[PDB]
């Protein structure tokens, strides 16, 4: 049970070789939605 | 959650010191209170920042939560209370086992989207054989050492 | 007097110091097991008594000095055993 | 007490912090001194849940024992000040900053008792050092003795510990993210309990050994009672039923392994099936790694 | 007569008959209570029953003071015949009063149930428990005393 | 005057049941206190008055407070009993004078004594050196205890006077019926210049 996890380690490693910080344009699109949301709530407040 | 606030002279803001209520604070951004913080942070008050002072004497005080010189290791549960525990678990092992075979035949003949959304009766999979073995074991191992240790300690 | 595992007395061993034959001694132990001076059991067939607990009674400065070293002796057992599971167990586990 | 109206005294963390803050309020050159406050709390069974406390101006001669001063008027003002803020806050006792008991204590216990019968002391420490809790609880009872000496106001020990609320919980939680104690999982947590327990037995016994050695030589008049109890101790040690006990203990262990065996085995099979899952996911990831 | 039945000490049926049979014959209740012990209509079943209760009192005490015991010795601690004293033990065994186990060919009664592990170790555990607590009260006692002799 | 901390030491003793003064010396003691407190809340507009006992283990019945009305209301329920002590009482008086609002008040003890003192003079004139350090003034009112006592208290009040005659003075009250000696011998006009 220590042995076969210690060899199971390698399959996860090939996947980590695949990006695990990818889809940065999704996150940048969300960030461009939080500037529209921030001001959506200053306009639902209706307060400057 | 704990903030701090200080009102700001709204009059002086109207008079042109509106960009002059900026004292030099650091920052970290808030939102859900933008309700009254859009004229709060930016008209009526602002955000102070909070810290703490973790003394070492207070830390060595709170750190206390167990007086064990009569707890475990000088005790151990009842050995007829402890067999009635094993009985129950190691029977539940059987019940779960069967369903486990029936899951290993299924997963083989299906694609991971249908085993993904499989959230009806979580009693079937690994999750419960692990959930068990780590309570069972624990128990028992130590269940285990407690008896031995006392045999020498109070020899 | 008997300090150890050896805590059994034989009927014909009590009777000789109690000055009475072995047909009184039975009752005699039963009054003790009643008032409480003794807790335990008579094993009549093999002529044994089981002296499990005997009320305390005052000691002097010479008996205490022996208890000190009897207790000391137990202390170092504890010390060494703690030192057994600080090595190994505490080391890794925490 | 003989009364089942006291037993578990449970002090919440903010009290501990409160007496440890009080000990530095006075702390100028008046430090190195017993400081005393009153314990506010609630209770309704075998408990005395302590919650709030506030220093009471207190002085005490450093060589005499009948020269102690305690502004009880201050109490009859503040007690109401805090009642006016929280109902259900009677005076359930009073705390005394250790390091241990003083002859004078009993005197105090009767100038605090003029409020609430059952008042208890709660010796709290101003120095972390003990490995058990820094919270010992005493009650002022009285008894008769087989030696025929006049009745006395002694002090009797009752078990103690600290508890918490959600509030308390969370504040403490917040204050110990520096000294993390959660990285440690279950199994090891309880091994810790069983080594740390010997760390207690060891020093308790050690203290009795220093006492016995203290009366035997370097004389300190014998108190027959201590030695009495100390005999029950050596009769209770597990010994006289040696052979049989052996043959049984071995058997119960045997069972224990049987079930450990099963546990570790299932664990193994499950982990291995996990591995098969990794290998197959790797093959099908290798068909994708090709393509275009 | 009640001070005999409360304490835990066996009673001779002969010493009971002697120094009390004259108290159960003068001033008795043979009509104000319907033959407490007089006559022979029901007043005989009464003696027989009283004898039972006396003797089974004795057995009930055997169960706290004996593991083994010889059959012969038992008969003299019951003042019954050596043969009638197995016939009188069944009245209690099967039933619900002390299921002591006898061996006839042996001559031995055993008032100790078979010892299994759960017993033996749950006694070891009781003792380590009380041992622990007792060390606690000891250290607190020594503490208290420290204050009287060093005069704090 | 200046704002001061006053400590009324009243005595409990079997001697406080003598008809040799105003009806019973108990009652009379009460009246005397009632005047010496009131008379030091009009010298200054603010002035803290205490009230301890001098018997058994010397005790506090009220700490420093400006209300003469508490000083008179606890004082009703005393009882003549016990054997007084001067040592214990004085020493608890300091501990009561330290704790006060404001540290500009002066330390003054107004002490009434009334039964033979059983402490030797050697210890009393050690306490008077510790009071000389602590700058404690102490007036001793011999309401009795002058013919049944050779005044060790003379060497007590002269241990506090290196040169000042107000630093500490032992006031006597003639032991006759003397209605008019417990009112003029008061410490606010016996051993000082002020009389307000």
XYZ file of C-alpha atoms in Angstrom, chain F residues 42-194:
153
model
C -17.440 70.152 55.837
C -13.741 71.040 56.182
C -13.331 70.022 52.533
C -16.275 69.650 50.132
C -14.753 66.282 49.148
C -13.249 63.880 51.670
C -13.309 60.075 51.857
C -14.338 58.483 55.164
C -13.610 54.864 56.060
C -14.723 52.504 58.806
C -12.863 49.432 60.073
C -13.119 47.528 63.348
C -10.321 46.802 65.813
C -11.276 43.367 67.166
C -10.693 39.660 66.478
C -9.171 39.734 62.965
C -9.416 43.432 62.155
C -12.061 43.837 59.484
C -13.429 46.380 57.017
C -17.127 47.263 57.193
C -16.907 50.020 54.564
C -14.009 51.100 52.377
C -13.196 54.689 51.427
C -16.399 56.487 50.407
C -17.509 60.149 50.661
C -20.958 59.344 52.147
C -21.088 59.867 55.912
C -24.491 58.166 55.584
C -22.935 54.742 55.042
C -20.469 55.272 57.913
C -23.374 55.898 60.272
C -25.579 53.069 58.939
C -23.103 50.193 59.234
C -22.005 51.457 62.662
C -25.441 50.814 64.203
C -24.867 47.035 64.159
C -21.693 46.436 66.100
C -21.543 44.439 69.306
C -19.296 44.656 72.394
C -17.171 41.504 72.233
C -13.668 40.201 71.636
C -10.247 41.480 72.643
C -8.934 44.340 70.509
C -5.557 44.437 68.779
C -3.633 47.503 67.665
C -1.175 45.788 65.279
C -3.578 44.001 62.933
C -5.865 47.043 62.744
C -3.228 49.630 61.848
C -1.707 47.393 59.205
C -5.047 46.751 57.487
C -5.621 50.510 57.656
C -2.698 51.172 55.313
C -3.952 48.626 52.782
C -7.256 50.483 52.916
C -5.600 53.891 52.408
C -3.517 52.886 49.375
C -6.648 52.007 47.392
C -8.588 55.221 46.751
C -9.570 57.387 43.823
C -6.856 60.009 43.413
C -3.356 59.996 44.911
C -3.372 63.615 46.099
C -5.254 62.835 49.324
C -3.372 62.675 52.617
C -3.300 59.545 54.785
C -5.105 60.188 58.082
C -6.345 57.529 60.525
C -8.875 58.598 63.174
C -8.536 55.809 65.730
C -10.804 55.185 68.718
C -9.360 52.709 71.229
C -11.045 51.210 74.262
C -9.514 48.206 76.041
C -6.072 47.309 77.469
C -3.537 46.901 74.662
C -1.574 43.638 74.849
C 1.216 44.358 72.349
C 4.658 45.319 73.593
C 6.064 48.771 72.822
C 9.033 47.363 70.855
C 6.816 46.112 68.009
C 4.524 49.158 68.009
C 7.555 51.412 67.488
C 8.584 49.260 64.512
C 5.169 49.783 62.945
C 5.572 53.513 63.630
C 8.806 53.460 61.614
C 6.950 51.783 58.743
C 4.234 54.457 59.053
C 6.985 57.092 59.124
C 8.062 55.681 55.752
C 4.489 55.511 54.422
C 3.673 59.091 55.580
C 0.633 58.002 57.584
C -0.882 60.301 60.177
C -2.689 58.633 63.070
C -4.769 60.137 65.882
C -5.573 57.914 68.862
C -8.653 58.776 70.946
C -8.437 57.277 74.454
C -12.169 56.849 75.029
C -11.250 54.981 78.168
C -8.031 52.968 78.287
C -5.806 55.472 80.085
C -6.211 54.469 83.733
C -6.422 50.737 82.900
C -3.413 51.264 80.632
C 0.070 52.728 80.824
C 0.368 54.548 77.508
C 2.729 52.671 75.210
C 0.933 54.865 72.668
C 2.951 57.855 73.910
C 6.124 56.275 72.528
C 4.004 55.354 69.501
C 2.968 58.954 68.657
C 6.431 60.350 69.435
C 8.014 57.849 67.020
C 6.011 59.628 64.280
C 7.001 63.154 65.419
C 10.601 63.908 64.515
C 9.772 67.611 64.811
C 6.099 68.004 63.830
C 3.540 68.168 66.650
C 0.698 67.479 64.190
C 2.488 64.517 62.594
C 0.989 62.326 65.328
C -0.713 63.158 68.643
C -2.309 60.987 71.347
C -5.596 62.586 72.468
C -7.030 61.747 75.884
C -10.625 61.862 77.123
C -10.991 62.234 80.937
C -12.640 59.068 82.296
C -15.401 60.709 84.340
C -18.961 60.996 83.049
C -17.321 63.669 80.863
C -20.068 64.471 78.364
C -18.138 67.589 77.312
C -14.720 65.952 76.726
C -15.667 63.663 73.799
C -16.774 66.754 71.800
C -13.861 69.189 72.333
C -11.051 66.609 72.276
C -12.156 65.761 68.691
C -9.163 65.425 66.323
C -10.369 68.267 64.052
C -9.635 70.661 66.951
C -7.268 68.722 69.293
C -3.742 68.484 67.909
C -4.075 70.824 64.910
C -4.902 74.431 64.082
C -7.929 73.881 61.886
